[model samples]
Target: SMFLPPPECPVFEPSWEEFADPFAFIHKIRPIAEQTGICKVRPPPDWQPPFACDVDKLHFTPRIQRLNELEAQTRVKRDYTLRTFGEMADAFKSDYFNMPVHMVPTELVEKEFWRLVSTIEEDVTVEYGADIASKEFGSGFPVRDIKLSPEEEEYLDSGWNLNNMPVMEQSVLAHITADICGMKLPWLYVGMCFSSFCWHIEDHWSYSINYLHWGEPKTWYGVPGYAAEQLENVMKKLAPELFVSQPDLLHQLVTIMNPNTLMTHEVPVYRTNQCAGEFVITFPRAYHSGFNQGFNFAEAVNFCTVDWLPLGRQCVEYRLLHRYCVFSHDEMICKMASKADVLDVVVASTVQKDMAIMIEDEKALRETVRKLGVIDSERMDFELLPDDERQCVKCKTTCFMSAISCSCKPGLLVCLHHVKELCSCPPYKYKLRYRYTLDDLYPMMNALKLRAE
Candidate 1:
């Protein structure tokens, strides 16, 4: 059978005492699994759920529903999935942040899984085919008919199977089992096992520990932080037709800042690999994707949906707010602040300094500073203002004296107009127009001082 263990292997497993600490075992086993292509270790039957995997069902269910609702919104554009594992692998190598998928309840998983299974059984291919596994197959295929080797049979006969036997049972007896069992909750029914699987960073609200059993091996790739930008750019270039809509554009934009690739490392598993496992501690807004290495089939149980509220919620809100700001005009000011600590707005007037307010183009003000510089030749590029009394407000772009004749209307004087429509901050609002220098905030320019001790 395809699930057969290698010949001449010992019947019984080694004792747990032979290993080091549990945490150390997890750490050591994961890298080995990645290197050896496949490794499996079973968790204690009652092993504590990992970070974010402890969320209750009630809370998790709604989160999944919310994600579905968001995704269901009309999308203007869509991009084709990156086909090659190599290309996807490259993204993980980059330092882009990924968005985390919120914790999904088993209910949603079941719903998604059955929906996919029905479609797949009907010979339909779902959008993301990589995420489904055995449990997702449901009753369509008889469990007995599925070929099983001695090792596979033993695993199936083990107490682990009991927890899943009833299928819909919420609670089951915890059997005394090896602490190093490879298991994953097979709750979702993705139509096609591997190819039809698609999910985003916003879906990961819990820690997921996956163990591969059976089938051809698959590799996991993650692209985190700013590296997602490159991937998004590539996607946009490769599939411009898919990004025609606002939702698609927004989704792609969110992918650029996803932390999945950068925050987490990749763990590749080969076929029948039972020694390897990944304990994924997901942060809010972390994005990740995976694909099979070749013709691989695998069984993985995920211990997830743990509750880490307040902190997790804060993380999600921060990312959502950040994404909103980025897609809006605030991104420009943030970008400008990164390059220079300050922006000087001098309200120059041409006719009479007191009578007229210079800089009238509110639309220009809303544009990113870089874009503004490119389009507005008459507009003065932002420059660092010196800390001296010699320079007056009239010297800045806001001053009427610095106003230039409008190209469209020569006699009309115009400076950067803070039009009400385009102005993010109202004119004359005593806001910090210039970002203060980092040095001004810190007496000592020591990087160590800035970092957490």
Candidate 2:
């Protein structure tokens, strides 16, 4: 009698393979629930199930039996929920999110004082065990006699508390799983009591799934694109002055734009307490937020966002070749951006300054060359001398320094006296010239002649 199966027993042994298709497994339980005369169910009109489901409500017969067995096994154990702060505080303080397995006493496990330990352990092992030593993995989650230094104790006291433990643990688990699965995991958040709320578009590469456990369940409002803009306008019209400071305004904006919420707009969209269950799975770039439903009891929740592009690649690679690569979600975005044409725009913008710098550099070089004695002008009064006796103005050696009939090109002086060395051309057959005109060379020539030579 204790082992009696359901009348329409549909539950089977749990396996990782089956869990992969969570939607499918839930679907399988639906028909069994209907057959057993359980509550009639229908998918929410907006619930875009991940895959097709042949039946309706998920059967709870097996879950109910499991709960009964768990209760009976713990009949004599002290109720953790009822434990006094004095009795539990020490254990709570010691285990308060410290990662050392032995520090978490066996007593806590029996009491289920912290439900996240087992989950964290399972997820960490699944993701990191293949490459890491078993002992290292064990050390990562030490649960006994864990002691912290004074600074560490102070650090914990600063902001670390029980409410954030689940979120922190889940974050580690999600990050490791994302590594194993070869994908990026988006930023996650954990709400305290009733503080769960969000109203932002998931970055271009993310999708989100939120799980709520315990507390007064919250509700979600989602909208897409311009809907958020329109809601902002509406809020401004309703309370123009207070609208800027309204905390829930963002949530309202999100609800107006979320594809799901807008498509079914007439209802005051909300997701009430669904008994510690996951509320929604939103795809990449979706905008969402939740209404403040107020919570008085303790709550635990986990959020996971996956990058669809990475997930798509992971699915194909894993399904076909069974190989996994470690890639962070942010890293993937960076890599994609680097490869895209957008990167060129960034490069162009950055290089524009350098181009101006180059022009300045060329001008500096010309000024430096003039200051060095590499360039000089013809001597004054060069035309006064006899044609044959006139000194070559440039090198100061006598030669036929004809002003107009000189071998040098216009705007230049031929150093006939040192012509062979200075001009470096067939003697008097060709010309050497200054590229600048006389006026242009005057200032430079004056400066050079007045130098401390």
Candidate 3:
């Protein structure tokens, strides 16, 4: 037997009224979609945002990928105009199947893709473009400041527009001061035949929404958030090398593996073929991988909802090694607390609950550090420091609420959990560097409660 396609994940057909508010619609569908990991949303037929780009004008550097399953591929980072890339993408698909590009069935490519990867004798490689939208290669979604026709103007401020997703009212990430370029900004992916993304989750376990602007279908394999650990356990056993600690996020360890292998391991995997004008939503901590069916263009961005607040806090302490933070959860909570009066009610209520937990945890941590003899303290604005400058020495978590610093090690610091990691010097020599005091935090939580009421 060749590849048996996994069961399709839930697909939603939203009425225009339900589609009016993207966040509200997403929240309404969470119960069903979260169980399956990834869900496809088919907007009402008339919701199309016109896509127009000069093939010659828009361009990007492409990344090359080999079709060897579980092989380590370097992220070594092409200049290709949209016109040239499209021609190459189309030709590659057409040549591979010995037929016209569109004539090739998606099912056949899926079967062949599995066969080729399993057949070590064959080495097929493809190139694709993946990058944050830049001035040279702008976002596929219509953005402001451009000369727009009436149709283009209609979607410029639409909530469904990916360019507007991050800054929307219900999104918690809108409050973070740091630029999370890749995580927050819409990434434009130009896909050729079989250009793929390996198994991975969004940074900070945030939800991601991807839209296929126009092109052939892109196939996806997803495991729900609850089963993420199970899938990781199975992957780690087979490809231990991929488990090695990465130096940073840029050096992330990931690979293409057969979904059947995961299915055999009892992990619940779901599949979907996302087509033009459809949106795919991946829930928090869901592990997802996919390949292009043929030439395609997609725009995607990660966002955090109020429901993701606690999970975001938990993920900061979860990854096994080489842990990284896109932005400090505490920092975002405090930022929202400062503006609590204006926050959405649901967001205020959620932030208050997370903040209460944060306060209790901070209290316990400060107590433990005090028992360790770290007495000196100061109000250091963790947000002002660059992300790299404020990370814990041992765990690498971005410190926002509190961290332990030592004069002996001029530039080194550790989270309260790793108080002894900063230096061998006595704990008395260490100083508690915190953005806020206990007294200052209660008022912040109170503000959120007031807003919620």
When 2 and 3 are scored with lDDT, the better candidate is: 3
Off by over 4 Å in 2: 1-198, 203-205, 224-229, 232-272, 291-453
Score every model by TM-score: 0.28, 0.26, 0.98
**Could you list the CA RMSD of all candidates, in the order they appear?**
20.8, 29.4, 1.2
State candidate 3's TM-score. Answer: 0.98
Question: Which candidate should be chosen as best, given lDDT against the real structure?
Answer: 3
Candidate 2 all-Cα RMSD: 29.4
What is the clash count for each candidate, in the order shown?
107, 19, 1
lDDT of 3 by residue, 1-453 (tens): 779899999999999999999999999999999999999999999998999989998878888788889887644245899999999988888888889988888999898888888788899999998888889988888888858999999999999899999998999998777777777889889998888888988889999999999999999999999999999999889989988777677777788999999999999999999999999999999999989999899999999998898899889874346487778888988999999999999999999999999999999999999998989999998888999999888888888999998888997878998997788899888899989999999999999999999
lDDT of 2 by residue, 1-453 (tens): 111111211223335454334334334543432232111112223322221111122111100001110111110001122123223333333354453433544333322321322233431100000111122221111122357544434324211122232233122223232222211222222222213233444422233434332223334444433244454454344335423322211122211122222333421222223223233433333344442222212222222322133333332221122121122232222222223332233322322223233234334544443443334334344323443333233432222212212344333443322333334433334332223333433343233223312
Tens digits of per-residue lDDT, candidate 1, 74-132, equal 21122222233223323422211242212323223333433433342443222322333
Scored by TM-score, the top model is: 3
Q: How many pairs of residues in model 3 come into backbone collision?
A: 1
